[PDB]
């Protein structure tokens, strides 16, 4: 069907199984002193994390104070200059002998592809943390400073009123 | 190879986010009538803590199951209103998820 | 919107679940 069937073990665990789970896990721990499914109550025991700390799904694999970059910068600049130079040479190829133009085209793309690699090491979450950091920091400083400004102006008004009433005495 | 129970339970949890899946599951009588399914739903609650929460793909179902948790004391009735209510309350629920995680 | 791009949706894809190994796992639930 369109919707896959519920998992099979879901139907094994009734309320009685839930209430008898404590004694079952106590007995299992006492006896113990891929997990084989010898009893229907085994699944409620929390599954163990794989030792390799890896998870595979759909053909793809998955697994501290914030809780020479100049070399990369100059590499990027020289790569951009070489990319412009190669673009000029490739368009010249198109001009004179376009029949073999593709011979350079993908080459240029490789440099562009390398640029993407040069982005990968530069990857930005810390920079986003920084920018959010300063925006809420400056917002709270603005709120604070307007607080002492308003309380100070109220105090100044109170002192002026006190002087006015003392003069009228 | 045969996938482990981790993979199937995680995929079930992430598929619970679909409104069509929830509507289909609640359409059948014996799914809600059987206490086994709700027992499994309450068993699934323990994935809201790390490091299990680091392995999720769509955080919305995190509330949905919790919303489904509410369904055990709110009633089936309300199945018809489920798509409308999720569409209407998507903004504030996304905001509260962001507050729970992004802050 | 009209171009169905793979592996990037807001909600879990129905085709992703169909192609996921959970489908055959449910089919091979007897073998489990």
């Amino acid at each position: 069907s369109l919707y896959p069937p519920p998992p099979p073990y879901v139907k094994f665990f009734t309320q009685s199984n839930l209430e008898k789970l404590p004694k079952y896990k106590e007995k299992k721990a006492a006896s113990a002193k891929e997990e084989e499914i010898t009893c229907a109550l085994d699944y409620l025991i929390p599954p163990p994390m794989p030792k390799n700390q890896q998870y595979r799904a759909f053909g793809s694999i998955w697994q501290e104070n914030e809780s020479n970059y100049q070399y990369k910068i100059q590499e990027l600049r020289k790569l951009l200059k070489s990319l412009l130079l190669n673009y000029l040479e490739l368009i010249g190829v198109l001009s004179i002998n376009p029949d073999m133009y593709e011979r350079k085209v993908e080459n240029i793309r490789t440099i562009l592809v390398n640029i993407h690699h040069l982005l990968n090491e530069y990857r930005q979450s810390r920079e986003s943390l920084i920018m959010l950091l300063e925006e809420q920091l400056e917002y709270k400083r603005g709120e604070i400073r307007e607080i002492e400004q308003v309380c100070k102006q109220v105090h100044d008004k109170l002192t002026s009123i006190q002087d006015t009433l003392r003069t009228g005495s | 190879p045969l996938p482990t129970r981790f993979e199937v339970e995680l995929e079930f949890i992430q598929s619970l986010a679909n409104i069509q899946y929830v509507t289909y599951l609640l359409t059948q009588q014996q799914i809600w009538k059987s206490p086994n399914f709700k027992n499994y739903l309450k068993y699934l609650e323990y994935w809201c803590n790390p490091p299990y929460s680091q392995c999720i793909v769509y955080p919305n179902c995190l509330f949905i199951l919790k919303l489904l948790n509410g369904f055990m004391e709110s009633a089936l009735e309300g199945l018809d209103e489920l798509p409308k209510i999720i569409q209407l309350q998507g903004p504030q629920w996304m905001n509260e998820m962001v507050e729970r995680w992004a802050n | 919107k009209g171009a169905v791009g793979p592996n990037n949706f807001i909600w879990p894809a129905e085709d992703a679940l169909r192609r996921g190994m959970l489908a055959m796992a449910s089919l091979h639930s007897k073998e489990l």
Binding site: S1, L2 | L79, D80, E81, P83, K84 | -
Partner: peptide, 25 residues
């Protein structure tokens, strides 16, 4: 003429009961 028209009694909240099954290829 027409004494009174009918009040709109639409029920979009109705979930419908369309059976879906031939999705697998």
């Amino acid at each position: 003429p027409s004494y009174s028209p009918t009040s709109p009694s639409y029920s979009p909240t109705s979930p419908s009961y369309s059976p879906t099954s031939p999705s697998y290829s």
